[PDB]
Chains A and B, each alone.
Chain A
Amino acid sequence: GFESPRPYKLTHQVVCINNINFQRKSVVGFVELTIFPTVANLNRIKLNSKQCRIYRVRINDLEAAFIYNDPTLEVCHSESKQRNLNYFSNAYAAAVSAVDPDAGNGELCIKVPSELWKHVDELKVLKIHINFSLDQPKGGLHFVVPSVEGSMAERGAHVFSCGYQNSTRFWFPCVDSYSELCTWKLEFTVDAAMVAVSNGDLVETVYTHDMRKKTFHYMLTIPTAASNISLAIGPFEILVDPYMHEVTHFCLPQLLPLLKHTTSYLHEVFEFYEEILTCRYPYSCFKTVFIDEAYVEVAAYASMSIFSTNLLHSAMIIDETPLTRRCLAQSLAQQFFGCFISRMSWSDEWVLKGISGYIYGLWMKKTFGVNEYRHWIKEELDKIVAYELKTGGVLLHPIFNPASHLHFSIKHPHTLSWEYYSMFQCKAHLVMRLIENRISMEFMLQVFNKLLSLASTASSQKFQSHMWSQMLVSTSGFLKSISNVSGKDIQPLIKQWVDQSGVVKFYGSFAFNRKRNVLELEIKQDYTSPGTQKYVGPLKVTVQELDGSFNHTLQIEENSLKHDIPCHSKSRRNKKKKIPLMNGEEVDMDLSAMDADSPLLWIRIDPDMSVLRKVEFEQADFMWQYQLRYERDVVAQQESILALEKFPTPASRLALTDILEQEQCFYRVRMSACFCLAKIANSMVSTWTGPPAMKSLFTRMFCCKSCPNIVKTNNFMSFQSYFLQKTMPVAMALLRDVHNLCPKEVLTFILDLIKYNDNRKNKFSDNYYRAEMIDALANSVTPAVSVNNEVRTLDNLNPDVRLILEEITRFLNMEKLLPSYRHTITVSCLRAIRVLQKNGHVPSDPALFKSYAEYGHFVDIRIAALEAVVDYTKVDRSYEELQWLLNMIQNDPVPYVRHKILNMLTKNPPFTKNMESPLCNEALVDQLWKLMNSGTSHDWRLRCGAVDLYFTLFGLSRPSCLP
Chain B
Amino acid sequence: PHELESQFILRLPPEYASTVRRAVQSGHVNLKDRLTIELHPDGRHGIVRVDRVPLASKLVDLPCVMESLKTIDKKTFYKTADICQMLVSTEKKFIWNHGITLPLKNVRKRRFRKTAKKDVEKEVKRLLSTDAEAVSTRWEIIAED
Q: Do A and B touch (CB < 8 Å)?
A: no
A interface residue numbers (CB < 8 A to B): none
Chain B residues close to A by CB (< 8 Å): none
